[PDB]
Each structure stands twice: as structure tokens, then as C-alpha cells.
Write a protein that binds this DNA or RNA. Structure first.
Ligand SMILES: O=c1[nH]c(=O)n([C@H]2C[C@H](O)[C@@H](COP(=O)(O)OP(=O)(O)OP(=O)(O)O)O2)cc1-c1ccc[se]1
Ligand SMILES: *P(=O)(O)OC[C@@H]1CC[C@H](n2ccc(N)nc2=O)O1
Length: 540
DNA sequence: GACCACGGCCA
DNA sequence: AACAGTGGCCGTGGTC
């Protein structure tokens, strides 16, 4: 049905490729093809014909650009129909889904994938006509950001492997101690990693009361919430909790990561999935580097393993109270804008209230616990749950919630303005125009409607925070190449850079001004910046 | 071996 | 466990 003109393909053609696995850094390029005007050009040798291309254009262009960089080839990713459909509707997350929705079939052949990329682009670009606010996000944010992400995935990050190997044995012993002590209290051994077996030990053999049930099957839950309430009911809970922390950090971080070091680059390579969340945030996978531990003392020792190359330093930049500043600009609340206009720290103030210490006596562990509460209360946590997390009576948890939103009376008016427009328009949008469709705002079941409501007014705040970060990544990346610095990781409101040790302080100051002034708001955006040889030393 | 659902937990 | 929201990976249990 399509003409099979031979390689080389024309210019501005749409590419179609097949990988041996989903990870472009680890994938073997199995087939390559291009399409334009109906014609489909199939590469004889994929690695040889990959050099004939001058732009990566089509579905998942970023992934092909990452494998190209893996081969020392500069093949920038261009237009991607996935970015058009993702801006039209964040529910369009995969090539299979967008194919079933807007037309065509996602197959496993490079030629058919090439032809589908051209057909999908004309359709989605036609629908995006008129949606100029979304076209601006496409032209100015999403499309150039893929090229930035391609270099981040290709560069990778250095990992102190011998440090994690020693950390594995160091924690392996501490796990055996707790494991043996939990068997002593239970009177018999069992599999502590099996929630079903722990359920019988805690709730049938012991007289411990079951606090709640699981969702799908209705079993007696052994989650950290149930156990945290049973710390005084039995000493076995105290050691089961210490056991969960270690095995989580060992089986997910300390042990898996050193085995993912790439052979050719000697670095760890993640994937930054650009069309994966409903709010416009990025997501990381294979391995996920956006959930490296940082809270517990042992978790912070895992960030020490993320190091710069010899003669380099890591530059970390983190937005301060970012979504609270976003809410101040969206709500227009005079008292909240006044807070960031006077340099006040909401997270430090909340910790000062929990621990009965002044703002000066608050430490980072206290301030991190207050962030969990400040954003929980903001996005609709119940007064009953808040009372249990803070161990305060239900009456005090109500007053804290009312005082929270009465300190900024316009934020609740803004939540209603967003909800009201949500049910009228059928979608909420960020400050830049990125939409999320939430259709259950008029559901008749109170639980389903209220769940849709909490998702509804969260997306503008979190989505605008995501957009300001993407805009900075698009503006900051070219200024780094002219300084010999690299862009490595993005953690939602945080950028991790890598610069030579002599230019590190110059890169830290430049990135600070770019991020702070990426888009001026009614409040100033303040960025905390630190330099170190490792990730933990730079976040300080 | 490959794949999945579930509870559970990290940011 | 809950009227916080956004993600992704783990081991267990069970199938094909
Ligand atoms: O529980 C959390 N729910 C949540 O929605 N978010 C959002 C909102 C925040 O704006 C942004 C960056 O978070 P984060 O950079 O950590 O804090 P931020 O608000 O910028 O204050 P600062 O400490 O950076 O100055 O993620 C974060 C949460 C947590 C992070 C850490 C522990 Se719970
Ligand atoms: P981590 O270094 O403490 O957090 C880094 C990023 C910022 C927001 C995101 N996050 C963390 C924790 C929770 N509960 N929810 C989030 O969205 O991780």
C-alpha cells in the first residue's frame, strides 16, 4: 500500500525503529525505517543507516536519539506525535494507546512504525491547530525538552560501586540480627517478606488488634501505618518496623543499582519518560532515580554513592517551597504572596509548631516531616487522619486545618473557582495551558466525586511547578554546553548538574539565576544551591 | 523463564 | 486504615 523506495530516505522524514528492549541505553537496534509521502524506506543495516539520518522525527524520537548518542552520533530528537497527544490529553501515555484512540495500529515492524508516525503527526497536529496555548508548550517546552532529556539519559551518572558493595554487607548483618530477634518474639521462624505470613503471626497467634483492611482483598493490613499504632502493644512491632526499612533500601537501592552500571560508559543510565504523568511531571525508570532515599540516616548514605567524575563536582539546585509559591501566584492570596515577599518559610514554621521550638531551633528532619503534613493538609487530608499522624486530638486537627486555610483565605476561594470551572469545562489547566481531563467532578457517588475533586485542584499547582522546571531545563541546557557542564538528573523541582571543579561555582551561580528568573511570578522563586563531590554533600 | 496482581514503600 | 496529590520498584503468590 506504500511505496518502498530504497535508503537513503528524503529529508524531514518520519523514523521508525525497533529495539531489542525498552531501555535505549541497553537496546540493540534491530530495524530502522523512514517514511514521507507514503513512501517507506527500510534500512539494510540499522547501525550503518543510522548515520544517514540528520534528525530523529517520529514516535519516541527521544529514545532513538539516546541510542544514537550511545554510538557517539549527534541525532537530535525532533517532532514527536506522542508529545502532541500528551498535551492534548495526559491520558495519552503510550504509542499503543494513542494508536487505538486517534487511528492506526502500533505494530512491531520498523516500516509500519515509520508510516504510523507520519500519519499520527498530521492528525494530532491538525487537532492541535487553534490550541495555541498548547502549541506554545509544544514548540517552546516539550519538543526542545526531549533533546535535553536525550543528553541526560545518554550521559548518565557515576555511582560509587565499591561503597555500595560495602554498604550491602554492613546492612546484611544488621538485617540478620533483627530477623533472628523477630523469630525469638514470634516463637518460630517465618518469612518476614511475606505480608500474608506476618498477618497470621501478628493477628492470630499474637493478640494484637487489626486496625485496617487492604483494598482489593480485604486482608488485615500489616502496613507501616497499622504497625506504627502498635508500637506500644507489642515489642515485635518495633523490630518489624526496623526490618522493613532495611530490606526496602537493600532490595531496591543498595543491591540492584551497582549491577546496572553500563559497560561502555561506566555510568548509571535512567530513562526520563516525558509522557507518563497526568499533571505534566516527568517520571524516571529503569532504574527510577527520582526516589533515591534521603530521609532516614541509612537512606542518606545511599545518596553518598552518587558521585561526580574525577575532577568534577555535582551542582544541585532545589526550588524552595515551590508549589506553595505557585499557589500564591494562582490564588492571588495577599497574605500568602506577602509570606514569600518577606522571605518566610512555611515548612520551617509548621515544624516549629509541631515540636514547640522556635524557627531557629528547627532541624532538617523536623522540616521534612512538616512538608509531608503541609502538602497533605493542602491537598485535602482529613482531620481524622491528621490527628492520628500528629498524635493530637481530633479537635486540634480541625483547628490546625482551619487556621491553615484562614491564614490564606483566598486559597479556598481559588479551589472552588478551579472546581467550578472543572465541572463546567470538563478539564482543569495549568498556568501555561496544559490540561488534565477530570470527568468525575459531577459523579453522584460522594466518594468518587470527592476523589476527582482532590485530583482536580492539585493538577494546576503541581503541573505549573512541573512547567516552570521544564522551561528552566530548556533554557539552562545550552548555557551549560558553553561552560563544559552536563545536565544529569531532574527530581521534579531539583536539578543535579555536573561541572569541572574550577567552573563549578560559576555553573552554580548561573543555573541559580536561570531557574530563579525562568518566569517571574507574583512571588519570587528562590532556589537553594549547593556544591559537593556527591549528591548528599551538594543538597546540604 | 515470562508475566501479572496485590500489598507495601521509596521520593 | 483514613478526604492529600504525582509517580515506580520491590517480594510474594500464583499461572502458563
Ligand atoms: O509529600 C509531598 N507532597 C507533594 O505534593 N510534594 C510536592 C510539592 C512540593 O512543592 C514539591 C517539591 O517538594 P520538595 O522540593 O521536597 O519541597 P518544597 O515544597 O520545594 O520545599 P523545599 O524543601 O524544596 O524548600 O513536591 C512534595 C512532598 C514531599 C517532598 C519531600 C518530603 Se514530602
Ligand atoms: P525527596 O528528595 O525528599 O523529594 C524529591 C522530589 C520532590 C517532590 C517528590 N515527592 C517526594 C515525596 C512525596 N511524598 N511526594 C513527592 O511528590 O520528590
Amino acid at each position: 500500500a506504500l511505496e518502498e523506495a530504497p535508503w537513503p530516505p528524503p529529508e524531514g522524514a518520519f523514523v521508525g525503529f525497533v529495539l531489542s528492549r525498552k531501555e535505549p541505553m541497553w537496546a540493540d537496534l534491530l530495524a530502522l525505517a523512514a517514511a514521507r509521502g507514503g513512501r517507506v524506506h527500510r534500512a539494510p543495516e540499522p547501525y550503518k543507516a543510522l548515520r544517514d539520518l540528520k534528525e530523529a522525527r517520529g514516535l519516541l524520537a527521544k529514545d532513538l536519539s539516546v541510542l544514537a548518542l550511545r554510538e557517539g552520533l549527534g541525532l537530535p530528537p525532533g517532532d514527536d506525535p506522542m508529545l502532541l497527544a500528551y498535551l492534548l490529553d495526559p491520558s495519552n501515555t503510550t504509542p499503543e494507546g494513542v494508536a487505538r484512540r486517534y487511528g492506526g495500529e502500533w505494530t512491531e515492524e520498523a516500516g509500519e512504525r515509520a508510516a504510523l508516525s507520519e500519519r499520527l503527526f498530521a492528525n494530532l497536529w491538525g487537532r492541535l491547530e487553534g490550541e495555541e496555548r498548547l502549541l506554545w508548550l509544544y514548540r517552546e517546552v516539550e519538543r526542545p525538552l526531549s533533546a535535553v532529556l536525550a543528553h541526560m539519559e545518554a550521559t548518565g551518572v557515576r555511582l560509587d560501586v565499591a561503597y555500595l558493595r560495602a554498604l550491602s554487607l554492613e546492612v546484611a548483618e544488621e538485617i540478620a540480627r533483627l530477623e533472628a530477634e523477630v523469630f525469638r518474639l514470634a516463637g518460630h521462624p517465618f518469612n518476614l517478606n511475606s505480608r500474608d505470613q506476618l498477618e497470621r503471626v501478628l493477628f492470630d497467634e499474637l493478640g494484637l488488634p487489626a486496625i485496617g483492611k487492604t483494598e482489593k482483598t480485604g486482608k488485615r493490613s500489616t502496613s507501616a501505618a497499622v504497625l506504627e499504632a502498635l508500637r506500644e502493644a507489642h515489642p515485635i512491632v518495633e523490630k518489624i518496623l526496623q526490618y522493613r526499612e532495611l530490606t526496602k533500601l537493600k532490595s531496591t537501592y543498595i543491591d540492584p543499582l551497582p549491577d546496572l552500571i553500563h559497560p561502555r560508559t561506566g555510568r548509571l543510565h535512567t530513562r526520563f519518560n516525558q509522557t507518563a504523568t497526568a499533571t505534566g511531571r516527568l517520571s524516571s525508570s529503569d532504574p527510577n532515580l527520582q526516589n533515591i532515599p534521603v530521609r532516614t540516616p541509612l537512606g542518606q548514605r545511599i545518596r553518598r554513592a552518587f558521585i561526580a567524575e574525577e575532577g568534577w563536582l555535582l551542582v544541585a539546585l532545589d526550588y524552595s517551597q515551590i508549589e506553595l509559591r505557585v499557589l500564591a501566584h494562582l490564588s492571588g492570596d495577599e497574605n500568602l504572596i506577602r509570606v514569600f515577599q518577606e522571605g518566610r518559610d512555611i515548612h520551617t514554621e509548621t515544624a516549629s509548631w509541631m515540636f514547640g521550638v522556635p524557627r531557629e531551633a528547627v532541624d532538617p528532619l523536623m522540616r521534612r516531616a512538616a512538608k509531608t503534613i503541609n502538602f497533605g493538609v493542602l491537598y485535602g487530608m482529613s482531620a481524622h487522619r491528621l490527628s492520628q499522624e500528629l498524635a493530637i486530638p481530633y479537635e486540634e486537627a480541625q483547628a490546625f486545618i482551619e487556621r491553615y486555610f484562614q491564614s490564606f483565605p483566598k486559597v479556598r476561594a481559588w479551589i472552588e473557582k478551579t472546581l467550578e470551572e472543572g465541572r463546567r469545562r470538563g478539564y482543569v489547566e495549568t498556568l501555561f495551558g496544559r490540561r488534565r481531563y477530570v470527568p468525575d467532578l459531577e459523579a453522584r457517588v460522594k466518594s468518587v466525586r470527592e476523589a476527582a475533586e482532590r485530583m482536580a485542584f492539585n493538577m494546576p499547582v503541581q503541573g505549573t511547578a512541573a512547567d516552570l522546571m521544564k522551561l528552566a531545563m530548556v533554557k539552562l541546557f545550552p548555557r551549560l554546553e558553553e561552560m563544559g557542564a552536563r545536565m544529569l538528573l531532574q527530581v521534579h523541582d531539583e536539578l543535579v548538574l555536573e561541572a569541572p571543579k574550577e567552573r563549578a561555582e560559576a555553573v552554580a551561580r548561573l543555573a541559580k539565576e536561570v531557574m530563579e528568573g525562568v518566569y517571574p511570578l507574583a512571588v519570587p522563586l528562590e532556589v537553594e544551591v549547593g556544591i559537593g563531590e556527591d549528591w548528599l554533600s551538594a543538597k546540604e
